[PDB]
Amino acid sequence: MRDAVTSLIRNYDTTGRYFDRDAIESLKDYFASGNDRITVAAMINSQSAEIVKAAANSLFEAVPELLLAGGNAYTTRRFSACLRDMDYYLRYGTYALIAGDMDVLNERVLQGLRETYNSLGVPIAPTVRGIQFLKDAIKEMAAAAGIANTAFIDEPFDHMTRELSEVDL
Amino acid sequence: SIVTKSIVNADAEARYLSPGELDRIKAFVTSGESRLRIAETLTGSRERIIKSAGDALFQKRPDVVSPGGNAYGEEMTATCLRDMDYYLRLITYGVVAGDVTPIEEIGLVGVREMYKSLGTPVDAVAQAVREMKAVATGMMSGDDAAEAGAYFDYVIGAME
Amino acid sequence: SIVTKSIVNADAEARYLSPGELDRIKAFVTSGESRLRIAETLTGSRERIIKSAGDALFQKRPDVVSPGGNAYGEEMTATCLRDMDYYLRLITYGVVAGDVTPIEEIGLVGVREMYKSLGTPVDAVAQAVREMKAVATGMMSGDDAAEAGAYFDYVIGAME
Amino acid sequence: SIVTKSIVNADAEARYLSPGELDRIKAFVTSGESRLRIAETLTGSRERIIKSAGDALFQKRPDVVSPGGNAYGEEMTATCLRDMDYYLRLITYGVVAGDVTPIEEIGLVGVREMYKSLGTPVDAVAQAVREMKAVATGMMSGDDAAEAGAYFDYVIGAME
Amino acid sequence: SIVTKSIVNADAEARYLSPGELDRIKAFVTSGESRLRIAETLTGSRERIIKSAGDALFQKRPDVVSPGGNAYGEEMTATCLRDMDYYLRLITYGVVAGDVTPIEEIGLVGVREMYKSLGTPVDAVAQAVREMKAVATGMMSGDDAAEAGAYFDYVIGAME
Amino acid sequence: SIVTKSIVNADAEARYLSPGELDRIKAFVTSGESRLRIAETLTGSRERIIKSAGDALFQKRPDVVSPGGNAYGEEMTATCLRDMDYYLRLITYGVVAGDVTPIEEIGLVGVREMYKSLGTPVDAVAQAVREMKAVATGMMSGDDAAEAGAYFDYVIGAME
Amino acid sequence: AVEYIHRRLLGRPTYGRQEINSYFDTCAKKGFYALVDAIIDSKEYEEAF
Amino acid sequence: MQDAITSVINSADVQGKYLDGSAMDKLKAYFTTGALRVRAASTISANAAAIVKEAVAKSLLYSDVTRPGGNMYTTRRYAACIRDLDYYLRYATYAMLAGDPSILDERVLNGLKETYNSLGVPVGSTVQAIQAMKEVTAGLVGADAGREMGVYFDYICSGLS
Amino acid sequence: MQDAITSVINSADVQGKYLDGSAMDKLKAYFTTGALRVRAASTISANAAAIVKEAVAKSLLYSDVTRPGGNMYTTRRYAACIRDLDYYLRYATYAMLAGDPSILDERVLNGLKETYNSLGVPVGSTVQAIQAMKEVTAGLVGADAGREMGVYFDYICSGLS
Amino acid sequence: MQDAITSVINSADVQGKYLDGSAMDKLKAYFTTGALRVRAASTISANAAAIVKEAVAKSLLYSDVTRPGGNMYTTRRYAACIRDLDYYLRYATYAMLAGDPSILDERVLNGLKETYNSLGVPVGSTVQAIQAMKEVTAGLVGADAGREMGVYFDYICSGLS
Amino acid sequence: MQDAITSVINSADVQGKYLDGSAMDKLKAYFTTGALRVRAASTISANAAAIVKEAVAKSLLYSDVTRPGGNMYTTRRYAACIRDLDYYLRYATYAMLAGDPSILDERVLNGLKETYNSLGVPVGSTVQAIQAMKEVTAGLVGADAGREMGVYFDYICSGLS
Ligand SMILES: *[C@H](C)[C@H]1/C(=C/c2[nH]c(/C=C3N=C(/C=C4\NC(=O)C(CC)=C4C)C(C)=C\3CCC(=O)O)c(CCC(=O)O)c2C)NC(=O)[C@@H]1C
Ligand SMILES: CCC1=C(C)/C(=C/C2=NC(=C\c3[nH]c(/C=C4\NC(=O)[C@H](C)[C@H]4CC)c(C)c3CCC(=O)O)/C(CCC(=O)O)=C2C)NC1=O
Ligand SMILES: CCC1=C(C)/C(=C/C2=NC(=C\c3[nH]c(/C=C4\NC(=O)[C@H](C)[C@H]4CC)c(C)c3CCC(=O)O)/C(CCC(=O)O)=C2C)NC1=O
Ligand SMILES: CCC1=C(C)/C(=C/C2=NC(=C\c3[nH]c(/C=C4\NC(=O)[C@H](C)[C@H]4CC)c(C)c3CCC(=O)O)/C(CCC(=O)O)=C2C)NC1=O
Ligand SMILES: CCC1=C(C)/C(=C/C2=NC(=C\c3[nH]c(/C=C4\NC(=O)[C@H](C)[C@H]4CC)c(C)c3CCC(=O)O)/C(CCC(=O)O)=C2C)NC1=O
Ligand SMILES: CCC1=C(C)/C(=C/C2=NC(=C\c3[nH]c(/C=C4\NC(=O)[C@H](C)[C@H]4CC)c(C)c3CCC(=O)O)/C(CCC(=O)O)=C2C)NC1=O
Ligand SMILES: CCC1=C(C)/C(=C/C2=NC(=C\c3[nH]c(/C=C4\NC(=O)[C@H](C)[C@H]4CC)c(C)c3CCC(=O)O)/C(CCC(=O)O)=C2C)NC1=O
Ligand SMILES: CCC1=C(C)/C(=C/C2=NC(=C\c3[nH]c(/C=C4\NC(=O)[C@H](C)[C@H]4CC)c(C)c3CCC(=O)O)/C(CCC(=O)O)=C2C)NC1=O
């Protein structure tokens, strides 16, 4: 896995150069916003099982077929599998919120997710809309808790739904 | 780094980050300023560190520069100082990252196999990092010398 | 968009962007504010556009809602208004992007094959976009109506 | 006919006609009386077939005879029955030819393009030839109905 | 076969099987019983066909069995009768399949290159198949002799 | 000749003649007397060469003179010797040309097709030109025999 | 078959997906004869040969 | 690419034997079923677009795959899906006429799994679409012609899965 | 490219009428000729090489053409001559099968005249060879089909001259 | 191939949602940086050959790779090296204008590693050449335009390594 | 996995024939060369690490691949490179002892190209490393033992390329 620091370290290592002015400025930029990420992560660790359920109910209010007959969140086995999947998305979104880099999401979530979902019949679309219902919930909850900047909260879910995304453009 | 190690250690355990690990990440996040100061101290004076450490090494272990040793000749001594420069760069990376996974994960895993394939005595390389540690901790304040000497200590420990 | 088209057209030619293409991108960058205003005008009043355009379409072409036509019944008329909503959304995308490559690259390439496989008259769909254009250019100022009617014009032209 | 198609096949393969397709031409030669009887019965009752098939088509799909539809009015319905006359005429030509190629040359190349120009729904024409097929095979004996229904089936397959 | 040829010829044209090709396959399907009877006639009396045809060939073309020819000696004459047996077997395959694509696709493509590399006169092989055709069409009824002589005719035609 | 071939080579490559092939034409010009001597000796003893080579061919391959073979009878054997006369004539033309191209233009393009028509075994003709080669190189001096045997070798190579 | 016929008649492999979605669409609605006709039509054939 | 006749001839030729009674019986079975194969092929050639659009109307319409995010979303993807289903029906008709599925694994099932896995095409949804196409054409041509169509439709679904 | 059937359909199509009884009369005339047309076509296809070799052995062999000084001297020109004769016989067989000489005017006699003037091919020797081939195929396949081949060979000669 | 605008639209479309405030803020960020992107693209289009030749003069000249045995030895290899560096600078300019590196891994970094590994091209030396090109163009266009050029130069070096 | 003896036996068994004189001559050739194979295998087992480190000192050292950015850069990559070269020398010794390269394409060259292409390993640089290993061991064991080592080294380089 990579955080932002090991990203800069691997970036400078492949050319064999030391840190310049700009590398120290980007490391200061990660270390200055570190406390903000950590109180956001602790506030998510407060209400994880609540946020996952609320994002799930907002997703099922969005796409109503999945609770109904032909949908994929049909039975309670499928309902519990979908809510555990949303718990996975919030967990690795917290991990990428603390790390500040998208390599944990790429190595442990997004690599080969589409294969499993296309095979099992799990749809990819309401998965993404549920991921960003989680993102919107986290964003307004942490903007309510005195935190000025929300770009780092914006980062990992936007990456996760740029990757599961179907490129049609 | 610290964040990578905490994330992976919570990741195998199928749990979130425990609050103790979270204040560990928080304390590392606060101490990053002193880490960057130690990194600028190590980066800006690399010429004198490599020069004085090579001088004290070849004073201490003269057989590797004598005919018959590995670092005998102009280009071989230049490659020897280049290897010392590599290890000082990895020391700076480990100082910034707050953990030795840059140093170990770049330049310490197959170091015995590589230096055995080159024909190099690894104890003399440990003496080179020892002289680098002496010059570097002679260059800083007390707690800064202790925090840099932790990573220098890890490199000499991972040699032997 | 404009930037994609300029980059690709310089990209095949193995050259950089010519300065005329660069002031084209600059003029599009300056006109983006008016493009976003037209997009908010089209986005905020989508209910009345879709409703009035469906009303004028079924007034104009009553056979597709008569028994025997495609959009006969409750759910079929709902799907018809949904297809009109899709095309108004693509109109908004083409208004923002400054070019018709969103509209063409999403909902105009195999439109003939799709609507032939569904059993749909494509001229009645062109009349639907015509009524959408009438309601939309009845909703704006002059130059705004011309700039939106360019993309509405492209959709009706790409139908037939 | 079958002879022109066998000749262009032996020409593109640059060889003489195989005894298999010589036997095919000979069997076609002997079955000339049966196909003459089929085309005779079809040329006999063309008006009754067209009237029953047109009323069955208008009963099935009323969108074409509705206001705003294609075949609205006396002359438009008469031209619709004229197009059904042309298609039954080509059906008789292909029935007496033993091949579908005169139907292809005269009335199957650009029917989608020209009906895209006139505004005629092509699936409605496929339904019209479906009703003509059902009525003509209702008139014939079952083996001859199978033969004529092969060519009718080919026409509705090339339609939709 | 016939079905392979019809499927491929409709397959390149991106269309289904035309109804004329379908009654071609149907007529071949009905004539398969007479094809199997001709095949049993050719299969059961292969000894007398090969023996009498070799006798009439060496009577007709004695130089290939004279010293200096290809089929001179015991094993060479045995290989000559074996090649005639191969061609009678391919004749039986082409009789069953209803087309010459077994015969051509097995034993007629590089027949000139093979028999030129062996040093064989190909006209004498054409005379061998001619005598095989004489003995075989002397063995059957009229239409059966014509249908088998079509494939024998194709083999002698593909020789020269 | 060599000059026409160098000219068509410089034409297809769209340049003037290189000094290498100018030196080739000059060396060909100086070696004209040797090739005149070779063609002189061949035009001298053509009957003896043809008689010994034809009897050697008939002794080697008796299939052509056997009953049922190609060259059976007085006129057929005389035409066989006439074809050997044509080939020795083209050998002399190519010997005096310095190139194999008049042999190619006059007697090497369609010899397989025309001998496929007449029924002549082409490998027997290759044996005939082999015997003509052996006899003519037996007559010549060894260096000139090598030159004439190059063209004879080319003819039997283009035969088989 | 699209790829090998393209390598035979144009002398190069295909570049991407559009190029293959466009030639196999000509193979779709019209067939192999129009595939050869569309490869021989192309501006790269005209400019190259 | 070989029908029942060419496969029987290939077996008897790889044996090197003449056509014995079992081969004669196999060819008699094919020559009895061939007229039914011809009539079913004509009936399927009649209603290609209707069978395809009824298969989409049964399975793929109004589900998530035609919604945003689905692989059948755009008009390009819809046209390519109709194109793929027309291919499956056309080659199932060819394999029905030949009486041998060699054309299916020669010319459909050759690189189809790797193509669909590289594009991101759902294989289960297209298997359900082919199954609905099979159900519609078996309702069209009857019981036994529908069965001899469904054996090659099941061959395509098995090679795709 | 038109048959007797396609020419009948074409003539009834230019004036614009349907099929009349006289068209059916021409069609039944074509069929009752067409059965023996098939058998004669199989006989000509069986023996084409012997027919061409007897044609050249009858007329062209011991003349100045197959000798030096003629246009049939070299093996290149001899192979081209045999190929020209094979093509005349094959297209005459196609015209015999179709019952219409439109193929001979369409594919054979299109530009054959001017290339025969430009290459210096003798028209008279070719016409003699075609007529020799005509009575060779007449003695082979029979009398009525001999007349059938006769008018199409004569069509080729009239387009040539 | 997508800029910042098309990627924002693609995210909002794969969601199926309308453009909310975060997308509006991202597009406002791009519409503020676009004029600086335009001016840096003009300044880079001014000095293509100068930036390339200064990158070779910094890194690759007078080293072993221009000596015999090096992969930049011959004039063909030198011309191909200048061509490759011009490609890297041109596509870095394109990715700077789009504000998204999708064109780089679509059209540069696609088969570049396997091509360079098959040819024998040193990847470290060309990474150092791209780094010197980045250093020269960041000296050319300033601090922040040099940084937004260097992010795509680092993208090319990371995908190459 | 088969030596010269097992391949000769497999050929005679797939024939179904007994061991004729050509098989006896092949086995006599192997039984004459076997002592030289044994002594060369002992001499190569003596100096495994020396041959490997001399191959790296000839080809891969002081080039770009041991510099930053190269695929042989880190200590992990250096150790894996020494491991890969030890594998090539060990399996070339095995194929020299067997007298048949079946073990090489069974157990080295099976998925090696796809592994190296997935990892980003340069194939030309490792082919040059195997060639230098061949040159060093042919200097070690002599002319003819070096040749019968180099035939399997060339087999590994040909299957890798
Ligand atoms: C829920 C909102 C959506 C949904 C979910 C759904 N998923 C499954 C089954 C599985 N999901 C996964 C997913 C992951 N595994 C991982 O390792 C990661 C990264 C951490 C993810 C995201 C896996 C592996 C399975 C298979 C079951 C298993 O874990 O062994 C189902 C069950 C499908 C079924 O019918 O069996 C469901 C319902 N479905 C929806 O409709 C929502 C959009
Ligand atoms: C086949 C057996 C089976 C059942 C029954 C089942 C039920 C089921 N009931 C649900 C919710 C619910 N069910 C109810 C109501 C009720 N629930 C009851 O059993 C009472 C009859 C009734 C109250 C009197 C309500 C109000 C919700 C919404 C809960 C929420 O907001 O999360 C949900 C969550 C998804 C949804 O909103 O529908 C499931 C999966 N799953 C199964 O596999
Ligand atoms: C960042 C992690 C890392 C390390 C450590 C590293 C070492 C490394 N050291 C090398 C050589 C060397 N390194 C030394 C160094 C020494 N010999 C002595 O006697 C002294 C004790 C000691 C240094 C103080 C010498 C002499 C050589 C040359 C060996 C030879 O030429 O055979 C080489 C081969 C040539 C080259 O490409 O540089 C590598 C790859 N590479 C790496 O990527
Ligand atoms: C964004 C680009 C895009 C378009 C255009 C699109 C169209 C689309 N239109 C459909 C149906 C339809 N669309 C119409 C629309 C019309 N019929 C009429 O008579 C009117 C003229 C016209 C609308 C005003 C109707 C009636 C259907 C239902 C067809 C059926 O049920 O057979 C369906 C199948 C059901 C579904 O999944 O929605 C698609 C995919 N999908 C897309 O992704
Ligand atoms: C099924 C298609 C097929 C054919 C035709 C075929 C022919 C074939 N004929 C051969 C030999 C031969 N075939 C002949 C036949 C003839 N020579 C004459 O003079 C007669 C005119 C004529 C037969 C009536 C002779 C003499 C040989 C031996 C050639 C030699 O020994 O050099 C051989 C080489 C030895 C062998 O393996 O049998 C092959 C492969 N193989 C095939 O798979
Ligand atoms: C200069 C290029 C050239 C060639 C090659 C050529 C060949 C040629 N060979 C002929 C005949 C012939 N050629 C042969 C020759 C042979 N058959 C055998 O038995 C022998 C093995 C072989 C002799 C090597 C025979 C037997 C005939 C007469 C064929 C017949 O009358 O059926 C004839 C027919 C008579 C004539 O018009 O002179 C020509 C034109 N003419 C040319 O102008
Ligand atoms: C003749 C043998 C053969 C087949 C079958 C074949 C399929 C094939 N289907 C494709 C795409 C496709 N196939 C589908 C089909 C589907 N996706 C869905 O969601 C549905 C479940 C399913 C339809 C029932 C779609 C939507 C695409 C377009 C993918 C895209 O544009 O991103 C592509 C990508 C390139 C292109 O569209 O033109 C190929 C090569 N190619 C062949 O040569
Ligand atoms: C399908 C209709 C069709 C025909 C008929 C046709 C004929 C045709 N005959 C040709 C030559 C020829 N045709 C002959 C003909 C003859 N030998 C004689 O002297 C006799 C008068 C006659 C033998 C019966 C000769 C000698 C040449 C070659 C003359 C030369 O170019 O050297 C050529 C020039 C290319 C070639 O060398 O073959 C064409 C195109 N092309 C066609 O597409």
Do the chains contact at H122 and A128, CB–CB below 8 Å?
no
Give the tokens for residue B3: 């964040």
Q: Which of H79, H23, B18, C11 is nearest to J108 (CA)?
A: C11
Mutation choice for J interface testing from K64, K66, K127, K157 by most J CBs within 10 A: K64
Q: End-to-end CA distance of chain F: give it in Å, rounded.
A: 24
Q: Which of J40, J8, J7, J35 is nearest to J150 (CA)?
A: J40
Q: What is the Cα Rg of chain A in Å?
A: 18
- Are J144 and J94 in contact by the 8 Å Cβ rule? The answer is no
Give the tokens for residue A73: 């969140």
Give the tokens for residue J23: 């997308």
Q: Report the C-alpha dihedral over residues A158, A160, A162, A164, rounded to 10 degrees.
A: -150
| DSSP for residue J64 | G
The three-class DSSP label of residue B136 is helix
The three-class DSSP label of residue K150 is helix
Give the tokens for residue F108: 């090497």
Give, in degrees to the nearest 5, the angle at Cα D85 between D83 and D90. Answer: 95
B27 and chain A: CB distance < 8 Å anywhere? Answer: no
Say how many Å lie between the CA of residue A91 and the centre of ligand 1: 15
Q: For residue J48, which amino acid is it?
A: A
Q: Give kind and range of the element (H or E) at residue D82.
A: helix D74-97
Mutating to test ligand 2, I would choose from A58, A72, A74, A75 the residue with most ligand atoms within 8 A of its C-beta, which is A75
Distance from CA of H43 to the nearest CA of A (A): 32
- The interface residues of chain H toward chain J in range 56-115, judged by CB-CB distance below 8 A, are 67-69
Runs of H (alpha helix) within chain H: 4-15, 21-46, 48-55, 75-98, 102-107, 112-119, 123-141, 143-160
- Are D97 and I5 in contact by the 8 Å Cβ rule? The answer is yes
Q: Is A76 in the pocket of ligand 1 (CB under 6 A)?
A: no
Give the tokens for residue E17: 């099987």
Long-range (24+ apart) CB contacts under 8 A made by J114-120 are: J114/K117, J116/J160, J117/K120, J117/K121, J117/K122, J117/K123, J117/K124, J118/K123, J118/K124, J119/J71, J119/K124, J120/J71, J120/K122, J120/K124, J120/K125
- The interface residues of chain H toward chain G in range 74-103, judged by CB-CB distance below 8 A, are 80, 83, 86-87
Q: Report the C-alpha dihedral over residues A57, A63, A67, A71, rounded to 10 degrees.
A: -140
Say how many Å lie between the CA of residue A71 and the centre of ligand 4: 21
Runs of H (alpha helix) within J47-74: 48-55
| DSSP for residue J60 | I
Give the tokens for residue C96: 């923002």
Q: Is A79 in the pocket of ligand 2 (CB under 6 A)?
A: yes
CA B15 to chain centre: 33
Taking contacts as CB-CB distances below 8 angstroms, the residues of chain C near D128 are: none
Residues β-bridged to residue B67: B69
Q: Which of A116, A123, A108, A84 is nearest to A156 (CA)?
A: A108
Do the chains contact at E4 and H35, CB–CB below 8 Å?
no
Per the annotation, where are the binding residues of J for (2R,3E)-phycocyanobilin? Answer: 81
Q: 3-state secondary structure string, C3-55?
A: HHHHHHHHHHCCCCCCHHHHHHHHHHHHHHHHHHHHHHHHHHCHHHHHHHHHH
Q: Which residue of J has its CA nearest to C10?
A: J94
B60 CB neighbour count, 10 Å cutoff? 12
- Are K73 and A16 in contact by the 8 Å Cβ rule? The answer is no
Q: How many contacts, defined by CB atoms under 8 Å, are there between J and K?
A: 34
DSSP secondary structure, C99-145, as one string: SSHHHHHHHSSSHHHHHHHTT--HHHHHHHHHHHHHHHHTSS-HHHH
Give, in degrees to the nearest 5, the angle at Cα E17 between E14 and E19. Answer: 140
Q: Report the C-alpha dihedral over residues A103, A105, A106, A111, rounded to 10 degrees.
A: 160
DSSP secondary structure, J103-132, as one string: HHHHHTSSSHHHHHHHHT--HHHHHHHHHH
Chains C and H touch (3+ CB pairs under 8 A): yes
| DSSP for residue K157 | H
Give CA–CA dist I53/D55, Å, rounded.
66
Give CA–CA dist B115/B158, Å, rounded.
13
B160 CB neighbour count, 10 Å cutoff? 9
Taking contacts as CB-CB distances below 8 angstroms, the residues of chain D near E16 are: 157
Taking contacts as CB-CB distances below 8 angstroms, the residues of chain H near A70 are: 63
| DSSP for residue A112 | T
Give CA–CA dist G32/G18, Å, rounded.
18
Give the tokens for residue D30: 């002997």
Burial of I110 (0-12, 13-18, 19+ CB in 10 A): exposed
| DSSP for residue D16 | P
Give CA–CA dist H86/C110, Å, rounded.
15
A169 and chain C: CB distance < 8 Å anywhere? Answer: yes
The three-class DSSP label of residue A157 is helix
In the block, tokens 């996952």 appear at A52
Give the tokens for residue D35: 């196909």
Q: 3-state secondary structure string, F26-73?
A: HHHHHCHHHHHHHHHHHHHCHHHHHHHHHHHHHHHCCCCCCCCCCCCC
C-alpha distances (whole Å) from I9 to each of I15, I19, I148 are 10, 8, 22
- Are K98 and K2 in contact by the 8 Å Cβ rule? The answer is yes
Q: Which residue of B has its CA nearest to K48?
A: B117
Distance from CA of J35 to the nearest CA of A (A): 23
Comparing CB atoms, the residue among H52, H53, H76 nearest residue C110 is H76
Give CA–CA dist F58/F54, Å, rounded.
6
Do the chains contact at A168 and H124, CB–CB below 8 Å?
no
Q: For residue H48, which amino acid is it?
A: A
Q: Which residue of A has its CA nearest to H65?
A: A123
Q: For residue H40, which amino acid is it?
A: A
Give CA–CA dist F60/F131, Å, rounded.
10
Point out the ligand 3 atom lying closest to the alpha carbon of residue B54.
Answer: 24
- Are F149 and F137 in contact by the 8 Å Cβ rule? The answer is yes
B23 CB neighbour count, 10 Å cutoff? 13
In the block, tokens 């380089």 appear at K157
Residue I81 annotated as part of some ligand binding site = yes
Distance from CA of J42 to the nearest CA of A (A): 25
Residues β-bridged to residue C69: C67
Which residues lie closer than 8 Å to A95 by C-beta, 6 or more apart?
Answer: A104, A105, B7, B11, B17
Give the tokens for residue C130: 């015509």
What are the backbone angles phi and psi of residue E52, rounded to the nearest 5°? -70, -35
Give the tokens for residue D129: 């030839």
Q: Give all strands (DSSP E) within chain K, no chain letters.
A: none
Residues β-bridged to residue E67: E69
Give CA–CA dist I2/I20, Å, rounded.
19
Taking contacts as CB-CB distances below 8 angstroms, the residues of chain F near E126 are: none
Which residues lie closer than 8 Å to I19 by C-beta, 6 or more apart?
Answer: D39, D43, D92, D96, I12
Which residues lie closer than 8 Å to K37 by C-beta, 6 or more apart?
Answer: K96, K97, K99, K145, K148
In the block, tokens 């796409």 appear at A63
Give CA–CA dist I128/D83, Å, rounded.
54
What are the backbone angles phi and psi of residue C90, rounded to the nearest 5°? -65, -30
Which residues lie closer than 8 Å to E120 by C-beta, 6 or more apart?
Answer: E70
E71 CB neighbour count, 10 Å cutoff? 23
Distance from CA of E7 to the nearest CA of H (A): 6
Comparing CB atoms, the residue among C60, C68, C121 nearest residue D61 is C68
Give the tokens for residue E154: 């194709």
Which residues lie closer than 8 Å to J125 by C-beta, 6 or more apart?
Answer: J59, J60, J63, J65, J71, J72, K64, K69
Q: Which of A127, A121, A39 is nearest to A90 (CA)?
A: A127
